[model samples]
Target: ECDTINCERYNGQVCGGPGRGLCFCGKCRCHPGFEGSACQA
Candidate 1:
């Protein structure tokens, strides 16, 4: 049911905050400073 969560470039689709984190299952698994649906917050 998950397809990488559409992990694209920052200028395009930032499913995981454009390098701030990574897409897991069907969502963005953000890092320490990253927090959000897109992991950019």
Candidate 2:
């Protein structure tokens, strides 16, 4: 979950992969922080 009080993911970012799939509840949810998909910053 977002560690920051402002709902910001730890480093304001999340982790995901192609094989493993996209971030479930992190910043990089669904697609990377760049690509717009399911979850985004």
Candidate 3:
């Protein structure tokens, strides 16, 4: 879970994967035009 993994670790960067959602599993899943573990993009 993101609560345990801490999305901040990927601060200012994308999770670099093939998925898209809103803070799920252990990373931030951003919407269109957004890309980052914390949805910073």
Candidate 4:
């Protein structure tokens, strides 16, 4: 399970750059809720 902050299901895009990010089951498996694709908001 992932958070809404970086979840692919939420971000609707593939994560990139240097980060512990990944789309798993549509959710962004980010670390510490620090950053993510959905974090664009």
Candidate 5:
């Protein structure tokens, strides 16, 4: 599942930054100005 993938590394935690790092469909949907698996980049 999407949560499983995201949570596997982030421990079910969402990204906290300029972009809204939302996990969907087993991928991180980063907002503008943000990029990375956890939107940390």
Candidate 6:
């Protein structure tokens, strides 16, 4: 589910990862800032 998921990639930048958040069931279980779809937008 994460091999193809670049949840940390927002606007071509690394915005979320590790403590920031993680992808579960093809969705973003992000932190505070990145809390939307794939932790982006």
How close to the true structure is residue 39 of candidate 4, measured as C-alpha lDDT?
Answer: 36
Q: Model 3, 1-41: lDDT tens per residue?
A: 43667444344344433354355566565668755444444
TM-score of each: 0.43, 0.16, 0.33, 0.34, 0.43, 0.37
Give the Cα-based TM-score of candidate 5 against the true structure.
Answer: 0.43
Candidate 3 matches the true fold with a TM-score of 0.33
Candidate 3: what lDDT?
A: 0.50
lDDT of 4 by residue, 1-41 (tens): 34444334334455532254555654555555546344332
The residue pairs that clash in candidate 1, if any, are none
Q: Quick one: RMSD of model 6?
A: 4.4
Task: State how far residue 23 of model 2 sits from its true place (Å).
Answer: 7.3
Better of 2 and 3 by TM-score: 3
Over 4 Å off, model 5: 2-4, 8-12, 17-19
Which should have the higher lDDT, number 1 or number 3?
A: 1
lDDT of 2 at 7: 24
TM-score of 1: 0.43
- CA lDDT for candidate 2: 0.35
**Listing every candidate in turn, what is its Cα RMSD in Å to the true structure after a full C-alpha superposition?**
3.9, 9.0, 6.6, 6.1, 4.1, 4.4
Better of 1 and 5 by lDDT: 1
For model 6, which pairs clash?
none
Range of the 10 consecutive residues with the lowest summed lDDT in candidate 6: 9-18
Tens digit per residue, CA lDDT, model 1, 1-41: 57745554444457545568776666656778976556666
**Candidate 3, clashing residue pairs?**
14-36, 21-29
